[PDB]
Write a protein that binds this ligand. Structure first.
Ligand SMILES: N[C@H](CCC(=O)O)C(=O)O
Ligand SMILES: N[C@H](CCC(=O)O)C(=O)O
Lengths: 276, 272
């Protein structure tokens, strides 16, 4: 029924742990929604892969989530979305698909002043033509794209300021500076963690657009116009059920998740057993 | 000459728990930095108070953090910032002061297409004239300001979508819609939690500017320029020391902090 639709969880999937930037932004906007997040740590990263390989891995997860019963499917990974942008809507219909490319593209079109827009992302994302095709539907805009393959490594290791990563960013970004873009889509789950460094390299006249923020807001809009929001609980002891799944080692998932989740705030020892 | 130790922590303070949006954004950008966060839950909220009241509460905490040796001071609270924007830098010099009004103001000036910019925030923030003063250098710019006092309540109770809060937002935001602003400064710690609802109310053309995000990037720039970044540890078992203090009830602080920090590793346990 439509009521049972409102009660289903939101499915989110990503190539791995970086998609938690999208999950965290969604939870910020939609605290009442139940969440199932799947990170494909056992088969990623997707960045360096071919389109057939990316589709095989990511559509297996999306098919599974939809088979399990989600009210909406969020493709949090820019690389996975780039590989199935043209067919995921029909593949999962009538389940709404919210993904990370189009909300940022739409925002960037509205946000540019000079009509010259840059996109950065993984190799597979940029090579796929997905952003290029999406921006083709925008009058009076020109798009320029750059792949930044080493950014994911730097983010996961926690090196997101200082001279070394600035030099790396400068090398990648120079063609966008030469093209005089005034808007830059952060087309990768990991790049919100580099926004300060990228802003330093691009200067103050370049508007950065976060995939996580625009997708989180887009999901709220989509659920609102479909009347699919989970009703706010009257009992304040009721809180959302959020489940996190890894296809690789869960301990490695946990260790890397601290890069993307909020900090833990700053514990008696006891021997556990059934003998007392 | 003065002591400015890159190994010392960054001090962040706020009227309460809402400033964790700023602390979270800073930590996103600067994972290696030690942090001391103070939220004035024992004396806030600041929104409905007078300027002498806001200054007395917030400068007490700022003075404490600086006396404790922080290498940089972040005023995460838009209301506190509005009350001491004119004198905080001089008061704490030579300790760098980064706050939440100026970086978003500079961004909004760059971001507008039609030159019409809105600002929303607490009563005290909007009445202070601080944003009007910050925008005084903006040419070919018209600025419109609106106070949204009940937004803080709705954010803290987690009511940030649906018909009731949309109607609240429309009542506040109508003067900005009539002014046809195309850029909107979220001039309050709590308002990033309403960005989806506010974007709905304002339409898809309006660029929202987050104070937390622009201030986090500005701190990275400032620490970089001053050669003040704490170095990346070579042993990755070494992690940043982060302390979070409240002037009010500490259990109440911990409970409300979840609204702004999101799920954390204390509770997340992944399955295979
Ligand atoms: N999640 C991927 C980044 C990591 C990967 O290459 O798998 C993306 O957003 O493009
Ligand atoms: N921290 C305040 C919001 C809460 C309060 O009124 O104290 C601000 O940013 O304006």
């Amino acid at each position: 029924s439509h009521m049972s639709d409102r009660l289903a969880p939101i499915g989110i999937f990503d190539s791995g742990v970086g998609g938690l930037t999208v999950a965290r932004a969604i939870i910020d906007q939609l605290p009442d929604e139940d969440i199932v997040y799947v990170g494909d740590t056992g088969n990623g990263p997707y960045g360096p892969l071919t389109i057939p390989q990316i589709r095989a891995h990511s559509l297996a997860i999306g098919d599974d989530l939809v088979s399990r019963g989600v009210k909406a499917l969020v493709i949090a990974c820019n690389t996975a979305s780039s590989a199935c942008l043209r067919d995921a809507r029909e593949r999962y219909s009538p389940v709404p698909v919210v993904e990370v490319i189009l909300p940022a593209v739409r925002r960037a079109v509205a946000a540019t002043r000079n009509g010259r827009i840059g996109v950065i992302g993984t190799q597979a994302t940029i090579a796929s033509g997905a952003y290029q095709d999406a921006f083709a539907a925008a009058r009076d805009t020109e798009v320029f794209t750059v792949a930044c393959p080493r950014f994911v490594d730097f983010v996961e290791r926690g090196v997101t300021s200082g001279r070394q990563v600035l030099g790396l960013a400068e090398g990648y970004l120079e063609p966008l500076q030469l093209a005089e873009v005034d808007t830059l889509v952060l087309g990768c789950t990991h790049y919100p963690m580099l926004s300060g460094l990228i802003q330093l390299a691009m200067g103050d006249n370049v508007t950065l657009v976060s995939s996580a923020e625009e997708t989180a807001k887009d999901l709220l809009r989509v659920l609102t116009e479909l009347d699919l929001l989970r009703p706010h609980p009257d009992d304040p002891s009721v809180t959302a059920v959020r489940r996190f799944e890894a296809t690789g080692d869960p301990e490695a998932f946990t260790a890397l998740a601290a890069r993307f989740l909020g900090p833990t705030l700053d514990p008696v020892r006891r021997h556990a057993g059934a003998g007392r």
